[PDB]
Design a protein around this nucleic acid. Structure first.
Length: 266
DNA sequence: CGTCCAGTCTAC
DNA sequence: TAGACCTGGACGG
């Protein structure tokens, strides 16, 4: 997912796990080529927070949980299929690659990182990816100034629809969002990134990088609401994959949707 | 059946 | 920077 999806996953984990207590190890699937999670505790709480296209879990042991241990942080990137589900222990989904198990008393559940295509990754540190810009959702001012302050970067030589996927500057923006953001302002996709941004030294392209993802979060759904959780989202799209929209391929063969003028660098 | 389509991460 | 990395759904013979 993109920014809003990671945000909604974080919200789901905090809400679902709020009154749960986990115990045991953190079981990785043998099939998953991500790291073993070396954590085990008689009783620990799980919480989440998001930043752009990253999600941090914190495993926090209870007072007197054994063994004595500091809380452990994990950072996930979801790839294309990543997600969290809370299921009964005995009905793990296909492709649950990392599982955390509730501790009795009560229904024996499993919080699962589910990732069909296995593009999602997790790291033991708790650190955000160095290089990643500030979050378009929760760090708008930082995000905005990081762009305007660095227009001389080679990244802004690229056309705008290519620049918007640079997670050094648009941490959280992915394919549907660049399409929907550009369509709101009718900015040609293959306009030169530096040229579109020097025009602002009216909601503008950088406000919309904040406000458009925020519209998706405020919708809810996407597996964290209530596959009809996607009804609203499908109806909310104005561009991405819509009848009578144009669509090219950027230099990395990613599909950009737009109306009218492709712009000078197609 | 068959083929094509849907964000990094790292080796060249 | 391409290509590699993966599964399943959507769409066509």
């Amino acid at each position: 997912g993109q920014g809003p999806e990671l945000h909604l996953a974080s919200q789901f984990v905090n809400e679902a796990c709020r009154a749960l207590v986990f115990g045991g190890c953190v079981e990785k699937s043998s099939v998953s080529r991500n790291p073993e999670v070396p954590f085990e505790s008689s009783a620990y709480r799980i919480s989440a927070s998001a930043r752009g296209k990253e999600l941090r879990l914190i495993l926090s042991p209870l007072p007197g949980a054994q063994p004595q241990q500091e809380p452990l942080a994990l950072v996930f990137r979801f790839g294309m299929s990543g997600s969290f589900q809370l299921v009964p222990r005995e009905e793990l989904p296909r492709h649950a690659h990392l599982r955390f198990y509730t501790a009795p008393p009560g229904p024996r559940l499993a919080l699962c990182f589910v990732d069909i295509r296995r593009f999602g990754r997790w790291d033991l540190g708790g650190k955000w990816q160095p290089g990643r810009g500030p979050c378009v959702l929760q760090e708008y001012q930082q995000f905005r100034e990081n762009v305007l302050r660095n227009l001389a970067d080679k990244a802004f030589d690229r056309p705008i629809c290519e620049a918007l996927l640079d997670q050094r500057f648009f941490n959280g923006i992915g394919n549907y969002l660049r399409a929907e953001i550009l369509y709101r302002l009718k900015i040609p996709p293959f306009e030169k990134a530096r040229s579109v941004l020097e025009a602002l030294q009216n909601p503008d392209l950088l406000e919309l990088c904040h406000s458009v993802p925020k519209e998706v979060v405020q919708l809810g759904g996407k597996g964290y609401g209530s596959e009809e959780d996607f009804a609203a989202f499908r109806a909310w799209l104005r561009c991405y994959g819509m009848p009578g929209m144009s669509s090219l391929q950027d230099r990395h063969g990613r599909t950009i949707w737009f109306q009218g003028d492709p712009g000078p660098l197609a």
